[PDB]
């Protein structure tokens, strides 16, 4: 079976991070930016879904 061409994401870097590590003061709320690119050259995506799921 043969499927069409698919894209890929690369995870360039997060703004205020060092290899995905951070400290939180247990009550303060922060934010930062996640940067990705579709490295494929032929066709683009049309559906993104983000579902965070922590250790707990």
């Amino acid at each position: 079976k043969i499927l069409p061409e698919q894209p890929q994401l690369e995870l360039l870097s997060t703004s205020k991070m060092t290899r995905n590590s951070w400290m939180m003061l247990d009550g303060t709320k922060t934010d930062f930016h996640i940067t990705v690119r579709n490295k494929s050259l032929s066709c683009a995506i049309n559906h993104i879904k983000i579902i965070p799921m922590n250790n707990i």
Binding site: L12, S21, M23, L41
Partner: protein
């Protein structure tokens, strides 16, 4: 077949049926990496070669004392290719694509693309034409493919800890106290008691007089330029597989550019390490 062929041949007469016995736009890529912003800068540069120089006074305008070409470009295309796919890539600053060019000219287009072990494949296309005589033009579509081929994060020797300033580049007016958040990553085996301190003492010099005084001026500016308002700080604990922020506070007194500031060095009180953690700072005080 043989039967179908020999069954309609013409037998010889008078015999039994059967018997038993017996190039003027030389171009180059000099791409270069930039680990600071995590990109690679590919810059093509094409110029009129010496072939055009020697061809000017042969057929183009032999009788004129000094002639020149009229190379007009209609397309300078830089394309990223992988297999059958291809996509155009735009330059950093604008490039007027209907550009003219004469003899002894050189043009560069700089292209920024993102950077391990996956070399890129690029194509350059130059569609142009030399205008000889008022309205006679000869088109050219030369093109060729090739491959894009060719500090702030400070690590600790004889250990696995890691150091990084959250804002390694800061600018502020002289005399105003500023703050730097030094992140520590520890994952080796156990916690530490590393202590950070800035020494405002002129390092003794070891060279001609010019180099000697240059070195002394550098060391003096390092010593008595910046002061750390939390000297001999005790970073409390850095438990294993965890991170911590050392909130350092400074204030500048001598205007200058303290790129990769020395003096700020952190001492580990487990093996007497003297790692130069301060190399990941680019303070600029006016």
């Amino acid at each position: 077949t043989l039967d179908k062929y020999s069954s309609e041949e013409i037998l010889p007469s008078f015999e039994p049926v059967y018997s038993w016995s017996s190039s003027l736009l030389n171009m180059r890529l000099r791409n270069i990496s930039l680990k600071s912003e995590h990109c690679i800068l590919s810059s093509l540069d094409f110029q009129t070669s010496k072939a055009s120089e020697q061809l000017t006074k042969k057929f183009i305008y032999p009788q004129e004392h000094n002639s020149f070409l009229k190379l007009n470009f209609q397309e300078i295309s830089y394309k990223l290719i992988d297999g059958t796919s291809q996509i155009e890539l735009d330059p950093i600053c604008p490039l007027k694509v209907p550009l003219t060019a004469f003899s002894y000219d050189s043009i560069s287009a700089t292209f920024k693309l993102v950077l391990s072990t996956q070399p890129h494949r690029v194509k350059i296309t130059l569609a142009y034409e030399l205008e000889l005589h008022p309205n006679l033009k000869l088109p050219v579509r030369t093109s060729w493919e090739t491959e894009v081929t060719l500090t702030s994060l400070v690590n600790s020797k004889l250990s696995n800890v890691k150091f990084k300033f959250i804002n390694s580049n800061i600018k502020v007016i002289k005399g105003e106290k500023f703050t730097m958040r030094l992140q520590i990553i520890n994952s080796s085996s156990s916690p530490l008691d590393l202590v950070v301190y800035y020494n405002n003492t002129i390092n003794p010099i070891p060279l001609t007089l010019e180099n000697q005084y240059q070195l002394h001026n550098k060391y003096r500016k390092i010593a008595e330029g910046i002061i750390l308002l939390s000297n001999d700080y005790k970073i409390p604990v850095v438990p294993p597989r965890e991170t911590y922020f050392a909130d350092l506070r400074f204030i500048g007194i001598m205007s200058g550019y303290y790129g990769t500031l020395s003096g700020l060095k952190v001492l580990d009180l487990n093996t007497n390490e003297l790692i130069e953690v301060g190399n990941g700072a680019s303070v600029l005080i006016q």
